[PDB]
């Protein structure tokens, strides 16, 4: 689709420049990222899991780190950009991060409604019967 292989690598590279500084410290040796996560990944919450993980690594993990070990600041940040950058090229090729994209149809419509003032409320409520005919359409897709 976009740049599958490469972007992965660009990422591990940002890590090779840090793998050490951090693996040095790690003392207890039990797996945090239990293969159970690989299960949520091979699942329907898969998109959520991955998005929750990236959300995890850029807001909790790295943040608390870049600062924790200042000498690491500059490089953790670098990796944490190849991540930001992977997210995008990803939630673009819709086939992968759909749970992070948003419908245009829902906006176009959400637009029409806003530009119909007091009247928009009426037509919205009048077609709800169709909304229900759609929602059902979505359910037959299983």
């Amino acid at each position: 689709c976009d740049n599958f292989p490469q972007m992965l690598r660009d990422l591990r590279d940002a890590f090779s420049r840090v793998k050490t500084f951090f693996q040095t410290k790690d003392e207890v040796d039990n797996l945090l990222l239990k293969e159970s996560l690989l299960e949520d990944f091979k699942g329907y919450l898969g998109c959520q899991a991955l998005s929750e993980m990236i959300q995890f690594y850029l807001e909790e993990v790295m943040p608390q780190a870049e600062n924790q070990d200042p000498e690491a600041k500059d490089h953790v940040n670098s990796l944490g950009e190849n991540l930001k950058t992977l997210r995008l090229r990803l939630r673009r090729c819709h086939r992968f991060l759909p749970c992070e994209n948003k419908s245009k149809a829902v906006e176009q419509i959400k637009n029409a409604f806003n530009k119909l003032q007091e009247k928009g409320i009426y037509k919205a409520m009048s077609e709800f019967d169709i909304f229900i005919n759609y929602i059902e359409a979505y359910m037959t897709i299983k």
Partner: protein, 204 residues
């Protein structure tokens, strides 16, 4: 008075050839040897592979076959002399597929039409399960860098890049011999490779 720990321990892997390496404690006496110990990331269980080794390298391929299905290992070496021993010196980083240096079995050259065909036999290591072929583990993204030299000529090269173990090289006719080397990698990964042993082919 208490034996010195080995300055550093590190791996020098290659598709199934996970030799461990370390540097000697200073003033190593003729009676000192070292103890090699492993650890499967995920189990706080260190297993002693060797009790004594008067070397500076131990081949741990056999106890690390699961490398490409596991989440790495942690080795550590210790100095031993008499009743005393040196603190353990663990590897600075976890040993996974990451640190395996990509090499290639060989390359055979065939001089055809006015072009040269070449197939790259990937590496086939004895101590390697059937279930694990270089193609199995590394299913997709196998790329190679090719360096072609001409003779009679100067020690200069042409550089190319392919995506299959069989490539060809547009020949111009006018040479008396060509030599080639390869260097594998996997775009998805940052694994370093090693330029193959030169494999010349006479055009005459």
């Amino acid at each position: 008075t208490e034996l010195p720990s080995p300055p550093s321990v590190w791996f020098e892997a290659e598709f199934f050839h996970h030799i461990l390496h370390w540097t000697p404690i200073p003033q190593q006496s003729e009676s000192t040897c070292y103890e090699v110990a492993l650890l499967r990331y995920g189990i706080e269980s260190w297993n002693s592979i060797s009790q004594c080794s008067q070397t500076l390298s131990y081949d741990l391929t056999a106890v690390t076959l699961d490398l490409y299905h596991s989440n790495g290992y942690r080795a550590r070496v210790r100095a031993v002399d008499g009743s005393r021993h040196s603190q353990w010196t663990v590897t600075n980083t976890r040993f996974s597929v990451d640190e395996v240096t990509l090499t290639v079995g060989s390359v055979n050259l065939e001089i055809h039409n006015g072009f040269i065909l070449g197939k790259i036999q990937l590496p086939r290591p004895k101590m390697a399960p059937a279930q694990d072929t270089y193609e199995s583990i590394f299913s997709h993204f196998r790329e190679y860098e090719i360096a072609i030299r001409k003779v009679p000529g100067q020690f200069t090269f042409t550089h190319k890049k392919v995506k299959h173990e069989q490539f060809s090289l547009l020949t111009s006719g006018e040479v008396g011999e060509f030599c080639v080397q390869v260097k594998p990698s996997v775009a998805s990964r940052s694994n370093k490779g090693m330029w193959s042993k030169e494999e010349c082919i006479s055009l005459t």
